[PDB]
A paper describes a structure:
The best of these was a chitin tetrasaccharide (NAG4) soak displaying diffraction to 2.8 Å. Initial electron density defined the positions of NAG4 and chitobiose (NAG2), which were located in the donor (−4 to −1) and acceptor (+1 to +2)-binding sites on the concave face, respectively. The −1 O6 hydroxyl interacts with Glu123, Ser109 and Trp207 side chains, and the −1 O1 hydroxyl interacts with Asp121. The sugar moiety in the −2 subsite establishes two types of interactions: a CH–π interaction between the sugar moiety and Trp207, and hydrogen bonds between Arg203 and the carbonyl group and between water molecules and the O3 hydroxyl/amide group. The sugar moieties located at −3 and −4 subsites do not establish any direct interactions with the enzyme and only the −3 carbonyl group is engaged to a water molecule by a hydrogen bond interaction. The +1 sugar moiety is tethered by Trp221, Asn135 and Glu123. There are CH–π interactions between the sugar moiety and Trp221, and hydrogen bonds between the O3 hydroxyl with Asn135, and the O4 hydroxyl with Glu123. Finally, the +2 sugar moiety establishes a CH–π interaction with Tyr145 and a hydrogen bond between the O3 hydroxyl and Thr218. As suggested by the crystal structure, these hydrolysis products may still bind the +1/+2 acceptor subsites, thus excluding potential nearby water molecules that would lead to premature hydrolysis of the covalent glycosyl–enzyme intermediate.
Residue numbers in the entry: 24 to 266
The structure:
Amino acid sequence: KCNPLEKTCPPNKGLAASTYTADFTSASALDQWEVTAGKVPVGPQGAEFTVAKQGDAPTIDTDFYFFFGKAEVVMKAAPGTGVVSSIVLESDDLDEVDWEVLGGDTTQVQTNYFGKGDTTTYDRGTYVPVATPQETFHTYTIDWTKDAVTWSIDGAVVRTLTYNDAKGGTRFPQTPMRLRLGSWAGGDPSNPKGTIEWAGGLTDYSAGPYTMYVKSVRIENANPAESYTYSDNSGSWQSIKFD
Ligand SMILES: CC(=O)N[C@@H]1[C@@H](O)[C@H](O[C@@H]2O[C@H](CO)[C@@H](O[C@@H]3O[C@H](CO)[C@@H](O[C@@H]4O[C@H](CO)[C@@H](O)[C@H](O)[C@H]4NC(C)=O)[C@H](O)[C@H]3NC(C)=O)[C@H](O)[C@H]2NC(C)=O)[C@@H](CO)O[C@H]1O
Ligand SMILES: CC(=O)N[C@@H]1[C@@H](O)[C@H](O[C@@H]2O[C@H](CO)[C@@H](O)[C@H](O)[C@H]2NC(C)=O)[C@@H](CO)O[C@H]1O
């Protein structure tokens, strides 16, 4: 994880196709993914992100990066107090767009972003109404262009971030991003008071295994390439070299 605003890092492996599809009911679905933590079994309901015990943070990263386009995930959130179901887009410069569902909040899901790992205040967050995310599969779409990031649920736009809303684009996500899917306990007793408070309370690991399900992943690469290179330390999209 070398940050190109701080130094010169090697190229990011890119998705050299205009679309990527993963149906997680097949075994060879994690061929272009890495299991970064825990075990992630593949079931009849798709890939399973289970918080069974303390420290369980099962995550999968794509091997590839994409430079603008679409990320669509069909997910059922994990239940349980303090359990976080996360759909994360992140670049090496720490540009990020994400979706977070909390097990005890049955009426909403959170949308969030940051530019260049800048979490000056936690004012980049938005709660949007969703019907029983822990009991119903929903399609979480992020549309990503130079002009705006759009968050949609089951084909309905629920949030738009334009380039200038991100401090005139100084904090807009515009660098090659990999998709991470995972569940973790934000209510882990060992987290800061503020994280446990945010996650909607403490996690009772005894009270069940809590499973997050991802049936499918759809990625559209607006700029298909074998690799992406950060030319400068500007962290801007104009500084991304590829062919
Ligand atoms: C700035 C910001 O707000 N960023 C958010 C992201 O943090 C967040 O992604 C999730 O973040 C959590 C908390 O950091 C993370 O959970 C942690 O995962 C790591 C690795 O799996 C664990 O660290 C390891 O712990 C083991 C113990 O089993 C050690 O042996 C090992 O040495 C540790 N390794 C390292 C490198 O530290 C933590 O234990 C674990 N914490 C908990 C409480 O479970 C999630 O995995 C992140 N999830 C995803 C999908 O990225 C993101 C999503 O909510 O949102 C951003 O806003
Ligand atoms: C110690 C600390 O930073 N505590 C609180 C924050 O954790 C919390 O922000 C939330 O952090 C999570 C990652 O650990 C994110 O997944 C989550 O999206 C993020 N929430 C927001 C709104 O960005 C905030 C929440 O208000 O409170 C801090 O005090």
